Amino acid sequence: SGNAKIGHPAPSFKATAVMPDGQFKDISLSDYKGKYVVFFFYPLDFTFVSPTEIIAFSDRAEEFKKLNCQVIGASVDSHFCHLAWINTPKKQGGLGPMNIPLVSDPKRTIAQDYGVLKADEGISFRGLFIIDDKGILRQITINDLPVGRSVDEILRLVQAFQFTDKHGEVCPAGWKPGSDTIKPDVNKSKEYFSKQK
Amino acid sequence: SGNAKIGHPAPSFKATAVMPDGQFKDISLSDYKGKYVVFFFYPLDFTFVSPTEIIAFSDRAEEFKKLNCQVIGASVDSHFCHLAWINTPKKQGGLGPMNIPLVSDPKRTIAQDYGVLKADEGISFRGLFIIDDKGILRQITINDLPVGRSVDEILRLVQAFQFTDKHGEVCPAGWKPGSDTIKPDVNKSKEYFSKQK
Amino acid sequence: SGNAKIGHPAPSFKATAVMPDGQFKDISLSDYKGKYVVFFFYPLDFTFVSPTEIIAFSDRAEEFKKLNCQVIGASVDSHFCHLAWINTPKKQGGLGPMNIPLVSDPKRTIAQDYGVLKADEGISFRGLFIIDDKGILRQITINDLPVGRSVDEILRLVQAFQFTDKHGEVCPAGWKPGSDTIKPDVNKSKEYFSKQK
Amino acid sequence: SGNAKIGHPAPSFKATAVMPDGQFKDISLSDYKGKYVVFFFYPLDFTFVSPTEIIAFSDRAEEFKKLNCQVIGASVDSHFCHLAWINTPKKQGGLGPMNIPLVSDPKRTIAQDYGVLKADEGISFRGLFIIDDKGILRQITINDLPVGRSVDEILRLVQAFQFTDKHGEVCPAGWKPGSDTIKPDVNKSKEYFSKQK
Amino acid sequence: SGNAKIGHPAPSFKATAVMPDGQFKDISLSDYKGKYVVFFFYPLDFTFVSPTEIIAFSDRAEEFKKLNCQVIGASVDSHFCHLAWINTPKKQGGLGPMNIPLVSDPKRTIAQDYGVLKADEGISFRGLFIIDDKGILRQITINDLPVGRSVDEILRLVQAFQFTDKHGEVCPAGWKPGSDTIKPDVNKSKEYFSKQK
Amino acid sequence: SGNAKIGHPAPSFKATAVMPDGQFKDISLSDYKGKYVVFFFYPLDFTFVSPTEIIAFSDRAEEFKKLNCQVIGASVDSHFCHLAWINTPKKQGGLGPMNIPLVSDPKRTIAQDYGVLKADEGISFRGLFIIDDKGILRQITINDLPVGRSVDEILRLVQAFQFTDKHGEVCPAGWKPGSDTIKPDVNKSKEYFSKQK
Amino acid sequence: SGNAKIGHPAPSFKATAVMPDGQFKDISLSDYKGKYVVFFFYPLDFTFVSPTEIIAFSDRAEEFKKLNCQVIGASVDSHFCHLAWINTPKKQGGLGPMNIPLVSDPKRTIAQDYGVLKADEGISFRGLFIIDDKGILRQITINDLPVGRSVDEILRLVQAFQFTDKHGEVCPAGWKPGSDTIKPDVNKSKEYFSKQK
Amino acid sequence: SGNAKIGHPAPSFKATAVMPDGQFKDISLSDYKGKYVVFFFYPLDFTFVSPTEIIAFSDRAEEFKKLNCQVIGASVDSHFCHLAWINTPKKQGGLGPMNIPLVSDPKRTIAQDYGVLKADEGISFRGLFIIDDKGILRQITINDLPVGRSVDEILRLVQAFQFTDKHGEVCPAGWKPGSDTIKPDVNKSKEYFSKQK
Amino acid sequence: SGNAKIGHPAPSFKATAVMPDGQFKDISLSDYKGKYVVFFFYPLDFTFVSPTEIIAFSDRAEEFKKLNCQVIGASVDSHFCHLAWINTPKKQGGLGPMNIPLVSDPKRTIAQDYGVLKADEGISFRGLFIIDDKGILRQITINDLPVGRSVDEILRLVQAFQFTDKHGEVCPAGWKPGSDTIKPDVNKSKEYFSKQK
Amino acid sequence: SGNAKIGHPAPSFKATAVMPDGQFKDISLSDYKGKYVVFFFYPLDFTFVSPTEIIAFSDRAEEFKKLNCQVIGASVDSHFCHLAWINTPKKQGGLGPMNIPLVSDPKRTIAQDYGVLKADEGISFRGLFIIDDKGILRQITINDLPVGRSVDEILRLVQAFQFTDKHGEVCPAGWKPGSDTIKPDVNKSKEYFSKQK
């Protein structure tokens, strides 16, 4: 969990990234205070699972946008290496044009802060972080190096967390838009448990 | 995450537990050595979101068993409390009969070892952990209190890691049984991008 | 025991509690300045000796009210577990309606502060503390698990104390209202010593 | 309480004491292993509440021997001061012939180990420790100066404990020889709850 | 010696004492400012050598008042014990009426302050401290437990110092009033050595 | 004071001294085991109250030899300074021949051990010690600088100590050879308190 | 400079490199014990001054080889990066085929060891070290980011060092093969200075 | 190395130097802001590679002045040891007149600050630091004792840096005045790369 | 050297000396500010080499006066000792009248300061220090115990140091008044060296 | 001063020196255990007092040779500076043919050990140390820079010590060969003091 604890302000940071239009702007998590943010880390540039999951995100970038949610990727590689990677063709193992910002963390501080730094390699694991509109860490997901994440599950989550923040109800197990939620009140909750069995 | 580090042995533990046939028993992580384990904490017994997750896991227990994987719940609550809750009918917010064991971590030391303890409440967060038959932790998943987790996603994840553990290939984003995988070699990986891109 | 010392103010604390009217409320020791307080811990909820000790106190609650004294009980169990227990009938091992508020000490801090923490189990022994309307500890009592306490001996004590408070005349051994008291002076004490044998 | 923790070996001690027959003699708490012990402190000699306590314990010392229970009393006063006090007629604030032994804790180390020391004046409060035949502390009772203790209650305790020892069964609230006990098992306990109320 | 240094101000103290008249009165060493003071300690109350000493001073008291000198004795025994001792026919070791005050040092602190505390026994030694009107310790005497002190010799000392305090001269070996003295000047000294041996 | 504690062996020492026969030797406390010793310091050589005090001893040397007691003097002055003082006419303020050994402590270590070292002046106070044949410190006497000490008094003591040593009785206050002693026993002591007045 | 000190063994290291024949190999600096080594660091990959420096070395490699001198390049970038770079057309800013191993140092330990890490960027400066066939560092050269080094100069140094390692003489300023060298003696030195200056 | 880091203000210093014009003078690196400074250390006065190195800089000095660059030499040798040497004809090994100041560092503090001190001998290595007009160090060159340096290379470097300084373009390897340079921009850098092999 | 640093303010001190005109006086080194000072130490009083050294300075004091130089003797011996020793016939190993102050350092603090205390003895080595008219120490001379210093050499030194302070010229080896001195200039020094052999 | 202490072994050292026969060699104070040794420091080569001092010792070298004493010079200057200055003719300010070795102390650690280092300047005061054939320091002489030492005296001192070590007598002030001495015994010395006055 590093220094990022769920329920608390997510570790801040200011890094150089590759915007969805080429060119290098200095992005800060803080610049998004007001929008949800799916900040995810991936191992190394020019590897395998990575391009598959980072492309999967850029492509669906719109779906997240319709949720006032800004996705943001990051690795320990330099921005120059990031650019070179996006220019590389997909069929060739590259990312190709991106609709998502890609952050570089060559100090590995952003990594240490989020506790996803595989020290023995100076690499970061497949950590994903869902921090909300106010800056509070709401979900954290880490996978070992051989297994990619699921944009769908991560979408489900954001919607989920966005619901609760505005309805004072809680999302039962495996909730999805339309599913039954429940009132977190000893009495009021029985209106949910009752219609179960 | 506290002490649990993906890629290393999952912190061990010895704790009292209410087995599926009712009745207590001292359980140890090691006991389950040789098969996958999905260890998951939930804040408190008699709550609202928790009951849904725990029950979802119980019922889907066979699915996990087929996957040669043991599901184990966990909470700071005492076994006496656990039992009492399982003994409460579902329509009253109770668990009902269980197919899974519910460990009890009253010294809050286990939650500690899994960096899932919400110190300001002596209660754990909605953290999940999947460790493999060799004892190494392969994936940490943590949710803020309001949003329940997804059994399907965990199943996907277990299947994933298993696939990679026995095949020597890696799993692309969103991978599921049937999907294409990518040979983690610089060259032999083109056979994947050459089409799956 | 712990930070609780006979003579000095009683370790402060603020915890959630289940109010007599079956309602959650954050209570503080301090909110009782001006009244004597009998603060007692009990191992766990849904146990055996314990339910006898608190119904004892809950039933004979008026007897303390007469003596302007609040009886507050507490264990490390969640206020959800607490309510659940009070909702379990007595013939089934429950508590049934209470006239005494029950407190949840999940972070174990209150038990640690009063020295009644049974480390190796994250449980509290059966410690009872009687505190005067000024807030300073007057009498402390701890029983090992198997042996429940005596609601009469507390009654006796809470009375003997309020007596010394208003008379500056000490209570001899086995004292009870009506019993002869002895004057704390070298001479005015024989008025008690000669009148015995 | 000090180094005195219930469930653990009661703080050892070796002091000079004034035997029942007069005659001084260094005795050690270990000397009484194999027998239950009622070790109690009293503020000072030639005081008030105190003698009412040590004679009461001395006279009913019979009932304790009938329980293979040794009673020992102590104060920071020297042994020469204890003899002089047993040799001072009751009717004059004195003790008179003693059945139980009184130990002198001049260096105050014993009061410290049991944490009954009232530092602000080199005196010990009214603390009582009922320790058993194995040497483990089973009950701690401590009183503020103005209020003497109850030999009946301590009797009840020394009785209740020995009961639980030999019966692996537990004594409810207010238990006294004859009254129903309860058994520490979710099912068997019902036998107790099923009745009462 | 603990804190008592010759030539420096004697360690201050404020203890409860049994006054010559009979009542208990807090007394501070400073209270006797302006007067000389012979302060002495004795092991215990109800001992042997001790009372003989205490009695020697309580009587010769006048001789001391003559020398504008206050006398005070002390032990670690309580004041209650102190009184009980004076209220004991001197025929059987009591002290009987006292013209001197008996100081109670239960905290063992003032003793510690003079460095006459026999820690291994929590009892003081036969320490004698002569501190003058200006409040500064002028002489220290300490005897093992067996042998008492000498009111005579102490009287010679008090006498001696006072002399030098006024005449700016020094008293040679075993000097009693009326004996030659010597002017502390290389030259003026001759007036003594010449008239001597 | 210092390390020299009453009850334990006197701190050892090996210094250079001027023997009663002229010429120097290296003495050690130890060289005197089996015989009582009276070790006394004195401020400076060629002073006043000092020679009066020291000559007093060399003279009565015998009365001490008779008690199998060796007397030894010490100051921070070199041994050459000692030898020059003895060769200075008594009338001139010298010592003249001596029958007592005088040791030098030019490193103040012996004075520091006995805690008679007036640091601010690098001079030793008027401290005297009496150590038994077994070598343990029995009495310690220290006077400020302007007042000598009585040989007659430190003679009585040595006799008082040798007595208690071989008789099993204790020398009351003011004891002197031939005076009433008393047996330290609650009973066998009354043979003394009774025959008082 | 870091842990690199001319005169002592150059800091040992083992990292994954990309060999000339393409292909990854874990190289260790000891692997070349026996031949001179010109180890050099360069900022990042896909930069400017850097690739002009690296291909300049790959192209002139044979010159070093004739000198039994292994050359090795290094940067913080991953090996997958170093590979994607060599597989980039020189005109495209790439490196093209390479004739020297390019080590990866993602943990910045190697940089830190040679003290060429630019902390504020986690990028290495343009540092080059030339260590001999015994493993000891003989020369260190470092340039601020914006100015590339000069292969000619390196060549000259390697020759000059090798020259001295074999001719027991020393190379003067500006020296190139076939230039006047000098005897490190006070006399044969004149052989240079004289017929010269 | 030491306290000198390229990118930061070059360690400061002030020491006694022999001006090119003979006669002492306390020089300070700060006296040179506004202009580049090539600062070089050398082992010892009256050595071999040294004279050739310093005499070499002394001569080409005009080429540096041309470049608005001050050159300064330094050794642990005194100012006197220095002068004597300069006042020695080259044919004998001396330096002969100079056009460069020679700093003296008997304290060895300037060397430690530059990390060029050879502790085992209290002599420095052949370290040369070229620092710019703003005080910030730009290049560090250190050779082992046996091998002299190239005044040519320095020259190229001082030139190279001055260039990058004034032009905002980067100098490829080997770069000399006239040589091609690249625009440090992803795109604009291409107009140089396409012009290559 | 202790704190005695050549070229630094000689260590200050205030001690009780024995003035020439008989009698005692608290003297300080700052008292002699304005004149040169030859502060010499000597082991012990009443010894051998010492008096021969001190009466040598006493005897030739006028010569040091003619240079505005105060000579001061020092020893750890008390001022009383000093006086007795000066008041002892030379033929008897005494000093006889003294025209020089003899300071007393019974606290060894002054000796520790001039680092000449022979700690393992309490005595001091034959150390002499000559400090100038500004308080700065200009020469330290200390001999082992059996070899005495020579007043002549000390006179030569004072003359030389004073000379230098006046003519800003250094005195060659062995210099005496009238001897050829040298100008501390590289050039103007040839006036000395060239006029040599 | 430093680690050099009169009466203890002289701080050992090993340094390269320039033997009288020219051309280097590494000597160690140790290479002399058997011959007296006069070791002297001088601030700098090519200065002023210094030369006059060392050519002074070098000339009278035979003086000590016949006293089995070995003179040794030293300074921070390199052996190279040493030599250059040696070959420098006296009339130019140089030394010329030496008959004494001149160790070199570039580490400035030998001066440190001899507490003759002048830190602030990196030089060493004019300190001279005469150690005996057994390695123990006997005399330390240190002058401030401007004033040279005196061979004559040093010669006198070596002679003195040799005499004391050889005859068991001590040398009064200004002692020279032939001068009489005192037999270091109280009475025996008397045959010296009488021959005076």
3-state secondary structure chain G: CCCCCCCCECCCCEEEEECCCCCEEEEEHHHHCCCEEEEEECCCCCCCHHHHHHHHHHHHHHHHHHCCEEEEEEECCCHHHHHHHHCCCHHHCCCCCCCCCEEECCCCHHHHHCCCEECCCCEECEEEEEECCCCEEEEEEEECCCECCCHHHHHHHHHHHHHHHHHCCEECCCCCCCCCCECCCCCCCHHHHCCCC
G84 touches G133 (CB < 8 A)? no
Contact D142, C141 (CB under 8 A): yes
HSE at residue D141, side-chain half, CA atoms within 13 A, is 24
Identify residue I56 by its one-letter amino acid code: A
Query: Across-strand partners of E141?
Result: E128, F141
User: A166: helix, coil or strand?
Assistant: helix
**Min Cα–Cα distance to chain J from H143, Å:** 21
* Polymer length of chain E: 197
C-alpha H32/C-alpha H69 separation (Å) is: 9
CA–CA distance, H150 with H158 (Å, rounded to integer): 12
Check: CB of residue D3 under 8 Å from CB of residue D131.
no
Number of domains in chain I: 1
Q: Do J182 and I92 touch (CB under 8 A)?
A: no
Alpha-helical runs (H) found in chain B: 49-59, 61-66, 79-86, 109-113, 151-167, 190-196
Rounded CA-CA distance H197/I23 in Å is 102
Task: Give me the half-sphere count of Cα atoms (radius 13 Å) on the Cβ side of residue F51.
Answer: 28
Measured between beta carbons, the chain B residues lying within 8 angstroms of A143 are 6, 138-139, 157
Distance from CA of A125 to the nearest CA of H (A): 29
CA distance to G119, H2, H10, H108, J119, per residue, from H112 (Å): 22, 6, 13, 6, 15
Closest approach of H187 to chain A, Cα-based (Å): 10
Contacts of I65 (CB under 8 A, 6+ apart): none
Three-state secondary-structure class, residue H91: helix
Q: Using alpha carbons only, give the angle D100, D103, D104 rounded to the nearest 5 degrees.
A: 150
Contact residues, chain B to chain C, C-beta under 8 Å: 44-47, 76-78, 80-81, 83-85, 88, 106-108, 119-123
Whole-angstrom distance, CA of residue I123 vs CA of residue H92: 57
Alpha carbon H72 to chain centroid distance? Answer: 7
Which residue in this structure is represented by tokens 């203790």?
A: D149
Contact H84 J85 (CB under 8 A): yes
Longest dimension (CA), chain H: 59
- Does the beta-carbon distance from C144 to D7 stay under 8 Å? yes
Spatial CA neighbour of E145 closest among D78, F175, D15, F170: F170
Q: What is the spatial distance between Cα B15 and Cα A121, in angstroms, rounded to a whole number?
A: 35
State both tokens at E173: 């070996």
Q: Are J96 and J55 in contact (CB under 8 A)?
A: yes
J46: left (phi over 0), alpha (psi -120 to 50) or beta: left
Q: Do H143 and G6 touch (CB under 8 A)?
A: yes
Nearest by CB to F81, from I77, I107, I119: name it: I77
Closest residue in chain G to residue A123, using alpha carbons only? G106
Question: Which of the other chains make 3 or more beta carbon contacts under 8 angstroms with chain J?
Answer: G, H, I
Residue H103 token pair: 């700093």
3-state secondary structure of F195: coil
Q: What does the block give as tokens for F142? A: 């220290």
* CB J135 within 8 Å of CB J95: no
C-alpha gyration radius of chain D:
18
A102 by Cβ neighbours in 10 Å (0-12 / 13-18 / 19+) ranks as buried
Residue corresponding to tokens 């010569």: I63
The structure tokens listed for F159 are 């006799």
Spatial CB neighbours of J125, under 8 Å, sequence gap ≥ 6 = I6, I7, J41, J43, J116, J117, J118, J142, J143, J144, J145
Q: How far apart are CA A50 and CA A43, in angstroms?
A: 7
Q: What are residue I141's DSSP bridge partners?
A: I128, J141
- Helices G49-66 and G151-167: crossing angle in degrees, nearest 10, is 30
Listed in sequence order, the residues at least 6 apart from C185 whose beta carbon sits closer than 8 Å to its beta carbon are none
3-class DSSP string for C41-107: ECCCCCCCHHHHHHHHHHHCCHHHHHCCEEEEEEECCCHHHHHHHHCCCHHHCCCCCCCCCEEECCC
> Which residue, among I62, I99, I106, I112, has the nearest Cα to I81 in the 3D structure?
I106
Nearest residue in I to F81, CA atom: I46
* Residues J181, J192 contacting (CB under 8 angstroms): yes
3-state secondary structure of A66: coil
**E35: which residues sit within 8 A by CB, 6+ positions away?**
E68, E69, E70, E133
| Closest CB from F156, F161, F196 relative to E90 | F196
From chain H, the residues in CB contact with J84 under 8 A are: 45-46, 81, 84-85, 88
Phi/psi of residue D33, each to 5°? -65, 140
Q: What share of chain F is helix, strand, coil (3-state, %, to 5)?
A: 30, 25, 45
The alpha-carbon radius of gyration of chain H (Å, integer) is 18
Inter-residue contact I164 to I156 (CB < 8 Å): no
Handedness of CA B101, B107, B110, B112 (dihedral sign): positive
Interface with chain I: mutation pick from F24, F78, F103, highest number of I CBs within 10 Å? F78
Nearest CA in chain J to I46: J186
Nearest by Cα to J133 from J35, J65, J38, J66: J35
Structure tokens at F166: 């071989």
Q: Does chain D touch chain C (at least 3 C-beta pairs within 8 Å)?
A: yes
Q: Which of D76, D84, D123 sits opposite E84 (nearest CB)?
A: D84
> Whole-angstrom Cα distance, residue E17 to residue E72?
10
- Residues of B with Cβ-Cβ distance to A48 under 8 angstroms: 170, 182, 184, 189, 192
CA neighbor of F61 nearest in space, from F33, F115, F113, F102: F102
CATH code, domain with C80: 3.40.30.10
CB F73 within 8 A of CB F42: yes
**Mutation site, F143, F155, F182, interface E, largest E CB count within 10 A:** F143
For chain I, which chains pass the contact test of at least 3 CB pairs under 8 Å?
A: F, J
G→A interface, C-beta within 8 Å: 44-47, 76-78, 80-81, 83-85, 88, 106-108, 119, 121-123
CA of J63 vs chain I CAs: smallest distance (Å) = 16
Between CA G71 and CA G131 the distance in angstroms is 10
Minimal CA separation from H80 to chain J, in Å: 6
User: Distance (Å, rounded) from C-alpha F90 to C-alpha F78?
Assistant: 20
Q: J81 to chain H nearest CA, in Å?
A: 6
Q: Are E28 and E70 in contact (CB under 8 A)?
A: no
Nearest alpha-carbon partner for D6 in A148, E195, C143:
C143
One-character DSSP codes across H55-81: HHHHHHHHHHHHTTEEEEEEESS-HHH
Q: Decide: D113 and D129 in contact? Cβ < 8 Å.
A: no
Taking a C-beta distance cutoff of 8 angstroms, is the pair G112, G74 a contact? no
What kind of experiment solved this structure? Answer: X-ray
* 3-class secondary-structure state, position D74: strand
Burial class (CB in 10 A: 0-12, 13-18, 19+), J109: middle
Neighbouring residues of I66: CB distance < 8 A, sequence distance ≥ 6: none
Count the helix, strand and coil residues of chain B and give each as a percent rounded to the nearest 5: 30, 25, 45
Report the length, in residues, of chain I.
197
| Gap between the Cα atoms of C163 and C76, Å rounded | 33
The CA distance from A184 to G82, in Å, is 54
SS3 sequence of chain E: CCCCCCCCECCCCEEEEECCCCCEEEEEHHHHCCCEEEEEECCCCCCCHHHHHHHHHHHHHHHHHHCCEEEEEEECCCHHHHHHHHCCCHHHCCCCCCCCCEEECCCCHHHHHHCCEEHHHCEECEEEEEECCCCEEEEEEEECCCCCCCHHHHHHHHHHHHHHHHHCCEECCCCCCCCCCECCCCCCCHHHHCCCC
Domain that includes residue C166, residue range = 1-197
Q: Identify the chains in contact with B, defined as 3+ C-beta pairs within 8 A.
A: A, C
Task: Using an 8 Å CB-CB cutoff, list chain F residues near E131.
Answer: none
Tell me the C-alpha distance between A150 and B106, whole Å: 34
The first and second tokens of residue E97, run together, are 């009426």
Task: Name the residue facing G52 among H49, H115, H172 (closest C-beta).
Answer: H172
What is the 3-state secondary structure of chain I? CCCCCCCCECCCCEEEEECCCCCEEEEEHHHHECEEEEEEECCCCCCCHHHHHHHHHHHCHHHHHCCCEEEEEEECCCHHHHHHHHCCCHHHCCCCCCCCCEEECCCCHHHHHCCCECCCCCCECEEEEEECCCCEEEEEEEECCCECCCHHHHHHHHHHHHHHHHHCCEECCCCCCCCCCECCCCCCCHHHHCCCC
Q: Which residue in the set E81, E108, E119 is minimally distant from D81, CB to CB? A: E81
Query: Nearest-CA residue of chain H relative to J82?
Result: H81
Residues A140 and H86: their CA atoms lie apart, in Å, by 72
CA–CA separation, J19 and J15 (whole Å)? 12
* DSSP for residue C31: G
CA distance H15 to H18: 10
* Cα B158 to Cα B69: distance, rounded to the nearest angstrom: 8
User: What is the spatial distance between Cα H136 and Cα H7, in angstroms, rounded to a whole number?
Assistant: 6
Resolution, given in Å to one decimal, reads 2.9
Q: Which of J76, F152, I181, G78 is nearest to H108 (CA)?
A: J76
Rounded Cα gap, residues C172 and B120, in angstroms = 46
Smallest CA-to-CA distance from H123 within H105, H141, H140, H147 is with H105
Q: Which residue of J has its CA nearest to I8?
A: J144
Which positions ≥6 away from G124 have C-beta within 8 Å? Answer: G41, G42, G43, G74, G75, G76, G105, G108, G111, G116, G117, G118
Smallest CA-to-CA distance from H86 within H115, H127, H58, H124 is with: H58
Rounded to whole angstroms, the Cα distance separating F70 from F66 reads 10
Name the residue facing I93 among J48, J148, J189 (closest C-beta): J189
Strands G137-143 and H102-104, how do they pair?
Answer: unpaired
Nearest-CA neighbor of F57 among F47, F43, F69? F69
CA distance D187 to B80: 12
Q: Per the structure block, which two tokens stand in for F184?
A: 């330290």
